[PDB]
Design a protein around this ligand. Structure first.
Ligand SMILES: CN(C)C(=O)c1cnn(C)c1C(=O)Nc1ccn2cc(-c3ccc(F)cc3)nc2c1
Ligand SMILES: [Mg+2]
Ligand SMILES: [Zn+2]
Length: 314
């Protein structure tokens, strides 16, 4: 059999939650296949169809600062680490669906929020009133799955195929941060009343939703230099959207105004306190082996406080 192998450093370090997939684009497909073979199994997919699928997915990501092919693979890798360290908790179909969902979750992203598309009156806002881009991302996933030689689930029954596409749809839609706030509240109450039940499919859906938020935001769980450098790419997009909001004669929110760049450290602080820390806190409560994500989030929260006190530059 042909078994994907990684260099010695990558082989060890890919198992760590804070792994950076590196600047070599051409290695990312191999890194993804390796993660599928270990998290799912070498018999989960035909290698030729998976490779064809990977390259078609890559081609439908755009040359944008942040919401790009590197983000897709980075998000899948965070999902890999969660699956590997919680391997008894997930099903055959969930391992198949969830790495694919992560790879595909920002397909055809142009670097603009759902809000910009609504204000711009983009056709996608007419087609999908809520979770606009996320419904677009899923649609793009269905299109690619339906290309000749791209049915990577061809061995699944009709009913299993439908289940996995439903895992992928719900996982992709969960990456709408607007939905995260409600989902985390429900999970927090369920955990704290001791009512959360992983044998309940509506509960599994919420847990996978949280996992998808955690994976999508995972730049806050990297080592500080990766965290800081990724934040430049995030803001590069936010500021381009703010420019576009100004062009429509609309005041952009502060995070999207390139003139407000000196307030970034305080905005980061607000984001760690309102979104990130609660997210990885609730995830750790449910999946205790995800602890390193929360530990690394607290470490970066401390780093942003050092930037605010003038003991670090950005
Ligand atoms: C949507 N995405 C991708 C994310 O939210 C996302 C994912 N990963 N990360 C790290 C983010 C992220 O940085 N979010 C935020 C969220 C709120 N903010 C508010 C401010 C702020 C800036 C200047 C100012 F003057 C006032 C406030 N800056 C942010 C940044
Ligand atoms: Mg997205
Ligand atoms: Zn994303």
């Amino acid at each position: 059999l042909m078994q994907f192998t990684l260099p010695v450093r990558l082989c060890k370090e890919i198992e760590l939650f804070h792994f950076d997939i590196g600047p070599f684009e051409n290695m990312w497909p191999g890194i993804f296949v390796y993660m599928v073979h270990r998290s799912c199994g070498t018999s989960c997919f035909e290698l030729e169809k998976l490779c064809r699928f990977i390259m078609s997915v890559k081609k439908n990501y755009r040359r944008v600062p942040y919401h790009n092919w590197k983000h897709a693979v980075t998000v899948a890798h965070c999902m890999y680490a969660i699956l590997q360290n919680n391997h008894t908790l997930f099903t055959d179909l969930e391992r198949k669906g969830l790495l694919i969902a992560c790879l595909c979750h920002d397909l055809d992203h142009r670097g603009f929020s759902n809000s910009y598309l609504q204000k711009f009156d983009h056709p996608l806002a007419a087609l999908y009133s809520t979770s606009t881009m996320e419904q677009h991302h899923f649609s793009q996933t269905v299109s690619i799955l339906q290309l000749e030689g791209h049915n990577i689930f061809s061995t699944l029954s009709s009913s299993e195929y439908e289940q996995v596409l439903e895992i992928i749809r719900k996982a992709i839609i969960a990456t709408d941060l607007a939905l995260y706030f409600g989902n985390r509240k429900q999970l927090e109450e369920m955990y704290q009343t001791g009512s959360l039940n992983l044998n309940n499919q509506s509960h599994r859906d919420r847990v996978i939703g949280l996992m998808m938020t955690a994976c999508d935001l995972c730049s806050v769980t990297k080592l500080w230099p990766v965290t800081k450098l990724t934040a430049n790419d995030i803001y590069a997009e936010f500021w381009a959207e703010g420019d576009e909001m100004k062009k429509l004669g609309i005041q952009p929110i502060p995070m999207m105004d390139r003139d407000k760049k000196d307030e970034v450290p305080q905005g980061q602080l607000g984001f760690y306190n309102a979104v990130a820390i609660p997210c990885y806190t609730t995830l750790t409560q449910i999946l205790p082996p995800t602890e390193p994500l929360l530990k690394a989030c607290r470490d970066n929260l401390s780093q942003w406080e050092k930037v605010i006190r003038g003991e670090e530059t950005a």
